[PDB]
Amino acid sequence: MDVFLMIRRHKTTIFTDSTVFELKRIVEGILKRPPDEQRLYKDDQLLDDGKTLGECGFTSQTARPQAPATVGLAFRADDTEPFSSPP
Amino acid sequence: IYNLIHLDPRTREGFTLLHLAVNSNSFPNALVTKLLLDCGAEVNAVDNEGNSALHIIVQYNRPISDFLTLHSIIISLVEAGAHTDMTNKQNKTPLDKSTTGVSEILLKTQMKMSLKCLAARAVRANDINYQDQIPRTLEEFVGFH
Amino acid sequence: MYVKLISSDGHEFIVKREHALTSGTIKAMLSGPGQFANEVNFREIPSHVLSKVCMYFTYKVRYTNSSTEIPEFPIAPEIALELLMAANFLDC
Amino acid sequence: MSLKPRVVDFDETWNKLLTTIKAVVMLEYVERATWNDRFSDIYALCVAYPEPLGERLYTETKIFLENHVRHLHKRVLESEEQVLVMYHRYWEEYSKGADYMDCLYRYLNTQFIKKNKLTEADLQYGYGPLMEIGELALDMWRKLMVEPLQAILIRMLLREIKNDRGGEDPNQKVIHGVINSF
């Protein structure tokens, strides 16, 4: 178990620990949304399917619990802010 | 016994009864320490140099001598209360002052981390005005940690 | 087996049930007439602090009882006080 | 942020806590949005910039429990010929009352109390009383509800058991609860 990222989305953040279809499955199991309705907007590009997270680009050694990586999943529309300013 | 420990008979450099009982003047008596702790004594005591009970037994320097009795005082100390990261008279920790490699690994089995401890260090190491902007109780707690 | 955590700012967070029982206060708020049959509403905690509070749980649970030398938690100097006055409340 | 010590008034907070602390000693409904918010008020009182206010809170909650204990004594000491069921129906509620309130006073038990109390060593061997909420509500049931009543409770039992010996069908649960209370 070598990856720890957050499926951030508008006003929401889910925390989870080998391809993108299973990630859509888990996002369904949490938010109750159709698998085809929700897809990725990972880092200004639309990730492919069938390929494991290793081939997408995220490496384990740079993705640790101290600094998880953001994964944009704002595809709720149809089938396709900063947290706060410290004082 | 309790009648005497109900008053502080500290002598010399503010050494308590436990401090004398745990160092070579009696260097390590397992039953004596157990009886003294059961009768009731401050497990955290401060001397002229601020050293605690663990700060003294960690520099025993004879690991082979009583390698089965040096594993009694430590467990007796960690149980019934003990603080494992106090700094005294200068920036130093019980693990930092460990002269022997045996003691350095013997300790590691019994501590536990909490967010309060990891937050306390950064306040003092990166010095900021930590006075009058926090609850009164935590002011002392951020002092020795 | 999932529990919600709403902050005063508005951002909502979600983490596993077993990963959020390390704090006694969060356990007390879920026991009583507050069985919530879950979403726990905090009224005085910002969002940035709550982010790292959530992050701390995985770090604690994963690297426990492990021979591998453990790394160090990165804490920014600017926010350091607020984690202290929040861990006092949450008893973490 | 609203977590730094502030200035608070006793009356406004205490005339608001009473309504929700009176509905937990007898089981009723409290909304899931107030049980979570009053956890941030018992904390504000314990940290006030002018002076701490915990001791007054302790003194007041003792008096609150005293009247509730005493009124049930009035209602029971006048129940006729059916004391046993009347002592069970209220014992069952009041037992669950205490542990559902102990959670609300966790901060007081952890920080203020247990720091100025007596040690177990002080208890033993003599030599050497502040007591924890939720275990304080169990020492006002002994002194004002059973000790002033430990004649009829024993007498009605020691004849029902005899009647059962001679042939009788008493409800097992009612009797068992009363003996288990002690």
Task: Characterise this structure.
Chain D: It is found in: Nucleus. Chain D: This is Cullin-2. Chain D: Belongs to the cullin family. Chain C: Belongs to the SKP1 family. Chain C: Keywords: Host-virus interaction, Nucleus, Transcription, Transcription regulation, Ubl conjugation, Ubl conjugation pathway. This is part of a larger assembly, with chains A (87 residues), B (145 residues), C (92 residues) and D (182 residues). Chain A contains two helices and two strands; from the N terminus they run ββαα. Chain A has helices spanning 20-31, 53-56; strands at 5-9, 12-16. Chain A has a two-stranded antiparallel sheet with strand order 1-2. By secondary structure, chain B is mainly alpha-helical. Chain B has helices at 2-5, 17-21, 30-39, 53-57, 73-78, 101-107, 115-125, 136-144. With 92 residues, chain C is of the alpha+beta class. Helices cover 35% and strands 14% of the residues of chain C. Chain D contains nine helices and no strands. Chain D has helices at 10-22, 41-46, 54-77, 83-102, 106-112, 120-123, 142-146, 152-167, 172-181. In chain D, helix 4 (83-102) packs across helix 9. Chain D starts with 9 loop residues before the first helix and ends with a helix. At the C-D interface, helix 1 and helix 3 of C face loops of D.
Features:
part of a larger assembly, 4 chains, A: 87 residues, alpha+beta, 2 helices, globular, C: 92 residues, three-stranded mixed sheet, 3 helices, Elongin-C (chain C), ubl conjugation (chain C), SKP1-like (chain C)
Present the secondary structure layout.
This is part of a larger assembly, with chains A (87 residues), B (145 residues), C (92 residues) and D (182 residues).
Chain A: E1 5-9, E2 12-16, H1 20-31, H2 53-56
Antiparallel strand pairs in A: 1-2
Chain C: E1 2-6, E2 12-16, H1 24-28, E3 39-41, H2 47-62, H3 80-90
Parallel strand pairs in C: 1-3
Antiparallel strand pairs in C: 1-2
Chain D: H1 10-22, H2 41-46, H3 54-77, H4 83-102, H5 106-112, H6 120-123, H7 142-146, H8 152-167, H9 172-181
Helix pairs in contact in D: 4-9
PDB class: ligase
Keywords: Complex, Cullin, Oligomer, ligase
Entry title: An asymmetry dimer of the Cul2-Rbx1-EloBC-FEM1B ubiquitin ligase complexed with BEX2
